[PDB]
Amino acid sequence: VLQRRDWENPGVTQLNRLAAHPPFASWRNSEEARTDRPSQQLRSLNGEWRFAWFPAPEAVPESWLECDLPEADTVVVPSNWQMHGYDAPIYTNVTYPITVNPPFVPTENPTGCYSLTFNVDESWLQEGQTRIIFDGVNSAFHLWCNGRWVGYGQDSRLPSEFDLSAFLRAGENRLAVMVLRWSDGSYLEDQDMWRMSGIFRDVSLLHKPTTQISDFHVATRFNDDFSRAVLEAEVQMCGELRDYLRVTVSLWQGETQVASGTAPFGGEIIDERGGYADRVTLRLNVENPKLWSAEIPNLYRAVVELHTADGTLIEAEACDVGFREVRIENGLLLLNGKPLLIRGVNRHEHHPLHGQVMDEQTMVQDILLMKQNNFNAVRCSHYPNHPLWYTLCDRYGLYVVDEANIETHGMVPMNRLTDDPRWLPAMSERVTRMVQRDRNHPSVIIWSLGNESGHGANHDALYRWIKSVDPSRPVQYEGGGADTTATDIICPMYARVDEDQPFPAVPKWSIKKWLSLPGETRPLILCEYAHAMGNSLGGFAKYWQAFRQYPRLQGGFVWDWVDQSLIKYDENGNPWSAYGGDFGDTPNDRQFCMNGLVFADRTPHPALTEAKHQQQFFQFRLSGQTIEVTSEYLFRHSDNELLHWMVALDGKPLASGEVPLDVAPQGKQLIELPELPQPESAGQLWLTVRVVQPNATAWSEAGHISAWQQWRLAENLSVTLPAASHAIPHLTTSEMDFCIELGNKRWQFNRQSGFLSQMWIGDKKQLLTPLRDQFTRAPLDNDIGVSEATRIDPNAWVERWKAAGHYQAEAALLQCTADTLADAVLITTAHAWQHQGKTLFISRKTYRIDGSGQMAITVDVEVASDTPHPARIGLNCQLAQVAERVNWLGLGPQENYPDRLTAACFDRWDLPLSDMYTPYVFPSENGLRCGTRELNYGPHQWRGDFQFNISRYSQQQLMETSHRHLLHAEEGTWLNIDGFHMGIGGDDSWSPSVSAEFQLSAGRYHYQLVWCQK
Amino acid sequence: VLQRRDWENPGVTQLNRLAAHPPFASWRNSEEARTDRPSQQLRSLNGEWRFAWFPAPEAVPESWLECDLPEADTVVVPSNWQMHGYDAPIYTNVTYPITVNPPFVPTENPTGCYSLTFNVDESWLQEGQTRIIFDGVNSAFHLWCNGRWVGYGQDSRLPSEFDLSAFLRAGENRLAVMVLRWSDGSYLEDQDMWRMSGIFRDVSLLHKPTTQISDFHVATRFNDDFSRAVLEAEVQMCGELRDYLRVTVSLWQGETQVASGTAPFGGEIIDERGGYADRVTLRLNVENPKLWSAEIPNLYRAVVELHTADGTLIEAEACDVGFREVRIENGLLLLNGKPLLIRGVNRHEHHPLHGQVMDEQTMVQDILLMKQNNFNAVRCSHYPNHPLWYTLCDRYGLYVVDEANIETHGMVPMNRLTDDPRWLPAMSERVTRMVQRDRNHPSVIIWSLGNESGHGANHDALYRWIKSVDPSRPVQYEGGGADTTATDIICPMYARVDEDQPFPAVPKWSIKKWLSLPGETRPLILCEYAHAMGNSLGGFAKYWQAFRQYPRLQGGFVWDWVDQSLIKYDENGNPWSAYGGDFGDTPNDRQFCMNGLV
């Protein structure tokens, strides 16, 4: 066993492992099978095991096979051993975590030795077959039972089963399992995720009788309009064939039996030598079946019984059946004859405390949040999931892409192993065992051959294998340029809507152009788009506009669902969120492990609301007084839907109402609004509509909002003058300062810097820092890309801004003058920002302080045409005071940016100061609100047309701090008020992705603010 | 080694075996490569070996690894041990010669223990890599060198190579080879022929330098009228890449150099991660090439040289190149743009004294008799042949169908193993290693996935693998009714000219009717017709009338070339011809082993 080194040989992937099959419980009662009750024949071995860690498999003492080591600890199974402190988890994206030298692995190969002592019932050993099932072990393992060697397995993400009938004794039995971190199977598992190890899914014992059901498959066929179905069930047995053996398949809808069939064994003739004596095929007719879809997940229950002709049951098995048909016809992917639009997301199995151990409670929480945010589909990135996941997607309704555990991203070239016939055996076990496990699940609609492994002849061979054994689902594969002969669907990753990226050999065309290339007929579904790393999803609306307009663009899967951060503890035992490199792991890919729409504890990022709104199932159009509502449901009528409408004048409600929705799938409804009020007061009128679900569902509460939209109606411009004040502000001119007094208010302008340096109400100072121009932001993850201090990427935005001096530029005063008018004081300033003799920006300002005590600020900025476009053009200061609440009239309530603001609505918003900070784990610019007309904070009020952010953290502190737990609140409050702000991008995060219409490239800018004390 | 029982496990088909590649001689001189002279770097180990027979592998004494058994005999290698009287040859057609219980084999498993003592030159051990090549061993074997275990192999009809660099010493060395009659590979080798065993093809040592040519492929493309060709050569190396390494490919017609090309290593970009640093592709233009066909077998000689930039040769390899194009267009199989008419025969490797040992003299005699009787094509029934066969078919002019060693005729139903994904590994080694060995031969015009194994998803997977790595030849397969999605050609066996035979699931239509079934567009070539058993071939004229009248009937392969009878001796020592059952073999299929035209 130490001399064969099976873990360094790609030709050996298992020894003594049993055939793959759909999930079995071996019920001995037909009613228990029908109702899905727990089976006495399936025991869990999850719980406390003994565990010892070793640096290599040669360091494991020989006594460990016979008895427990004294130095072993007690640990919970399932678990990852890096989550218990035995060695460090490693976060690496592309580079393999070991030397690339296939098929050898390091001689330092951390080894986990697990053991369990357990009782077996007397009844289990007299008759039948006892097997052990390991649902997942990472990465390869050898198994012993009572000191004797049983078998060996590889592939971390599919179950491994072994017959223990010959090894078990009555009384106390002992299992010993030796798990290796690295194996030749590690070469095929280079997914972008934490690299961990252990017995990380369930362990169980199953008892079957000697004559047994060994496999069964369920298939459904329809007539042209889905009014008649045939359920075809193939059953195979093992053991001794007898003439008295019979198989019955019955189909249940709730407690009503719908169809039934019975036959003896013996298939029809297949070839010159006969047929399968040990198989049978039943056909069951079903009239007007209820169809399964993500909108209405109607399920039936199929029970399969092996019994004698005189009626004695031997064993029963069962599964959930959904009647649906998936096909590609004339370049469109169809479900039940209608074209799908995929609102998809990629999801990893990740928990911040338990690593890669999934429980039911976590899975249900992810499914409810997905459906509540208008997702209908999920991609298993990038391996088969825990078996309970597919059951939940069947019951709640999500389309699943099921993916083989094959990724060789770090190879050079990427197809070095997948073009080699010596690795064809290892790859075929990963594809064929996934299909034999999952082919009965209705939620699985597409198979995938894996991810990022180039294009090799091995992929073509396996594409054709699946089409032949399971013709009822399309196959997709992205490697080798996303449109090879190994895919039914064009499935690019990160292709842009309008812009081509012409890389050699593997170009990423714009998605609209890809469709129409000479010869191309397939549908296009992006397997990854809109990389959600940090403050991201800019330009998301542009994908959804294209998906709705082009029939053959059928949607895509966002990258991705949840941040893969882990929890660490500081000195005081306070938890904090950690990422690549925080465990001493090296090399590592730092914060690239956090790409989620939700934080690792399942709290939402602000981008989640942008996804929910673009993916809505109702679309709205306004024409005069008429709202047109269009349904994008394919199958359901809107029977749980109420339309609420509200008209408001600059935040104040004027009229409201509700109307029930009655709209057929893909239909329209016209709603006529009552004669709207005509107010005399100035301001913009706004109409907001929202779709509300009055009743609770399996996945949502009563009152859930599923869709919304907002429009401008009539506007009345203000033609009244400000009330003529009696008091005149007084100007005092020293050598150092201009000082303006009016009543208890006082303003001070510094004549050497040319900035407002202080302001008094009574005797209380209002500023800690002067009001100054600001042209920079703390860089987002999309601004940095793959750039680092070792290896600078000169094309990233942060690198262009640094090389040009934007972070270092010094303001030089050109002019600072004051003048008394009739009723006001006017201050005029000009500044130039320079770096090594080059002028980057010029700003010219006027400040007008009138008798009402208002200060009107006008700003004019010029930007040199050859400097990189600036991140923002605005003012900043640090206010002296801290208030509890922020009140504003503008887009809200959540963080919104110029290329991510469709989901935000214009209204009067009011939040505690802490909701104005988004706590991204990697700190950056955050919390901006756009389209704002008025902002109130303490005694201050700003009016204008601006974007702002307000918080306790300076742009400087956000840029210098790598983790959110290291930030500290500064004295007072930092306010940033911008006339203009650049987009955030997010098509990908490793190349510039801010579209030309969101860059500040106009050269001249103007904005105005009024600062008063109300 | 006795506790792992690798010969009863379809997941293990080899241990420590090197990658498959085209034939190599490792010349150290470009002229010797061009003119095909014998290479000092390739030694034959054929001759006298020591041999002992045992009833099972558990009966082999442990001392046999270290030293010769006193009770061993001296025998010639290559040989079948049943031809020397150690146990009986078995003739069975369909029924497997062992209990059908995959993947187990009988505990009584006759075992042949071969050994050889040999000298290795001092120069071979200082530098480079020494490998041993076994061209064929039936059915599975373990190998030891100087007492230490080297490796394990299965598949009887393709070579097995092992690195011996770490095991050899200067002076006297000893090989020990333990050959098993039955293995899980026997389940895939149910061809209709005598069931024999032993080291039945050549054994050799090859010396390569550490930096070496590890593979090369040759492809030819034409303009619309075959007046201009491009020869494309892909070369791969192993060992340490250096900037000074260069590859030259040159093309010779007789003594005239016709084309030449030179490049450093480094392929073009393939994907997001780059290209192959250890490969290069040369393109050579050739104007008015002479085309290869069975009527005029014009050959060129391609020499591949690995050398330094300053001109020092490291190693040379060479092969014969024939310019021809094979394609299917509008339902016709075309060679050099013209539709073929196949005058074919099936041929087994059989000799009445030596069993399944083929020599050059026998091969040449069969080729001259075939051409003298107006045959132009030969089907390798039903496994890859001795490597010299394809060289002779290139030089004299015969079209070859090359066939994978896969036949599971005695299974019930016939696709029990070829529809199971647990046997997909074992089947893929039989197909992928044949293609990597033979893809440079001009005479090979069609690949075949094997014979009589029903139709399973494993056949579809392997059909698609060949179309992707070698698009220049059609693929055929007869199982599952001769017209499945795993064949480019409809290729029935024993379909009649005018009469239908409507069997359930797998009907044999008349060949004229098969052509015109709704939807059918492929050419039809019979992979077996006109069974020549005894006094036979009545109605042969009726096939040839139909072949000439219908364009899409493009001929067929007669079953078969030579009778598989063996020689026995009577009391007076007079030789006589024997058939199934004459060796006490039971059950047997009697005279069904004699189907030959000769």
Ligand SMILES: OC[C@H]1O[C@@H](SCCc2ccccc2)[C@H](O)[C@@H](O)[C@H]1O
């Ligand atoms: O979340 C990161 C993404 O990285 C890019 S590679 C290019 C970017 C990169 C490369 C190397 C290190 C870090 C990032 C992959 O294509 C995506 O599937 C996803 O894994």
Ligand SMILES: OC[C@H]1O[C@@H](SCCc2ccccc2)[C@H](O)[C@@H](O)[C@H]1O
């Ligand atoms: O030379 C015999 C031929 O037998 C028939 S099986 C049907 C005939 C048969 C079956 C069993 C025993 C003997 C003959 C095969 O299909 C041919 O390829 C060839 O091997």
Ligand SMILES: [Mg+2]
């Ligand atoms: Mg990757």
Ligand SMILES: [Mg+2]
């Ligand atoms: Mg046969």
